[model samples]
Target: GSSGSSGKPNLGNGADLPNYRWTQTLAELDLAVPFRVSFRLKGKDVVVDIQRRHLRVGLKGQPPVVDGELYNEVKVEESSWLIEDGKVVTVHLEKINKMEWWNRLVTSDPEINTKSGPSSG
Candidate 1:
């Protein structure tokens, strides 16, 4: 079992990119979609699906912006999504197992060492 204290590095957690940003706590994960002007211009155009171990987000009938298995299982019933002002796609996910830190949002993404704090400005 990989259990330990949830210090600052694990406490204030997340990653940022030009098209993606995700933040998390021991209990939940918050995601805000891309910045392309026309990507998520309408609520109807967005699709956010959450399962115990999988997540898929994108527009209807188009390729998904994010499609992969989660790093950890989530409480499907507690997860949800929505669009913000026709510009942002937001997803809220509740972790099935609490009190643990996630190294990354998805299994396919680069691993982040939660043991160490931020190393850059």
Candidate 2:
């Protein structure tokens, strides 16, 4: 059991963190926070880029987007960003159906969805 700084990871501080959001869904539009998102609605040319291990979002090209990461093995094909009435820019992600729900939302593995399963307890 030995480990000492495997690498120089970009493990930045939590002073001004990358936000977490988009906690709405078709099933429960008030309580699902799988993917990281923000409803800031500011910044021109807003962008939301999601990779297997990171979620980077911010304005077109500026220091407004304090970068960081999140945890969600999402289906990038369905995730997206949008605006309402030429304002309110927002970003979102869709969890791959089979791999749904995070045990910790930002730390642990997903709680996959099964075809046939028992109801909640």
Candidate 3:
């Protein structure tokens, strides 16, 4: 209506749009066999900005955008997505570290947390 153009949506000017139909976007993921984490969203439309093995928490207005750092790095080649028809947009990581609990998600908070725990090889 008064937002955008096209049968789709209008692209607007610099710092002139208020949007957050998707604030809680990034999924705590898994891989290869590809771990599946879903955001409780509706509709057949979505947008995932950066694609890598990174812990991208929904901070500000990047619109589910990965304008952050790489939380965890993986083979960005074999990964993919599955946006559902109910209430979800799932991120399936393609690094099949098969058979394990899906904990140990990484961080994109600039410097590594080397001071948090003991150093090991």
Candidate 4:
């Protein structure tokens, strides 16, 4: 697991305000069927697996497509920009998906600092 923090300006004081904490959870939803999502952060591409149960897509180098379908393999281009956090930082959401009722539901505890190996399926 990873954590991040940010700071904001306080109107009352000339000094900066206390740091605000935030966390970005690497998450994926598998519905016993195939799905995908993609986007870019800081001009770097990223993809998420939204098909297999008990899977969390790991952070890696730039991907060809952000969120690509397993079956049809559709790809969509997206725009990304920098988010100001004291300094300019690039933050882009590649993709997100909600579990649908068309497929079976499954859930499990999240794994931390683990990488998903190459997929053969």
| lDDT values, one for every candidate | 0.75, 0.40, 0.33, 0.25
> How big is the positional error of residue 96 in model 4, measured in Å on the Cα after superposition?
4.7
lDDT of 4: 0.25
lDDT tens digits, residues 1-121, model 1? 7944322233348766445777888778888886466543676767788899899888788888888899898888889988877777888889887787777778766666666557663
Comparison by lDDT, 1 against 4, better one: 1
Better of 1 and 3 by TM-score: 1
* Cα lDDT of model 2 by residue, 19-81, tens digit: 333342322111112222344443356665655545555557644342444444665666666
**lDDT for 40 (candidate 1):** 36
Off by over 4 Å in 2: 1-21, 24-44, 64-66, 103-121
Error of 1 at 31 (Å): 0.9
Off by over 4 Å in 1: 1-11, 38-40, 117-121
Against the true structure, what is each candidate's TM-score? 0.78, 0.44, 0.35, 0.20
The positional error of residue 116 in candidate 2, measured at the CA in angstroms, is 24
Minimum summed lDDT over a 10-residue window in model 4 is located at 100-109
Q: TM-score winner among the candidates?
A: 1
Q: Which candidate order results from sorting by lDDT in descending order?
A: 1, 2, 3, 4
Candidate 4: where is the Cα deviation over 4 Å? Answer: 1-76, 100-121
How does model 1 fare in lDDT?
Answer: 0.75
Model 2 RMSD to the real structure?
A: 11.3
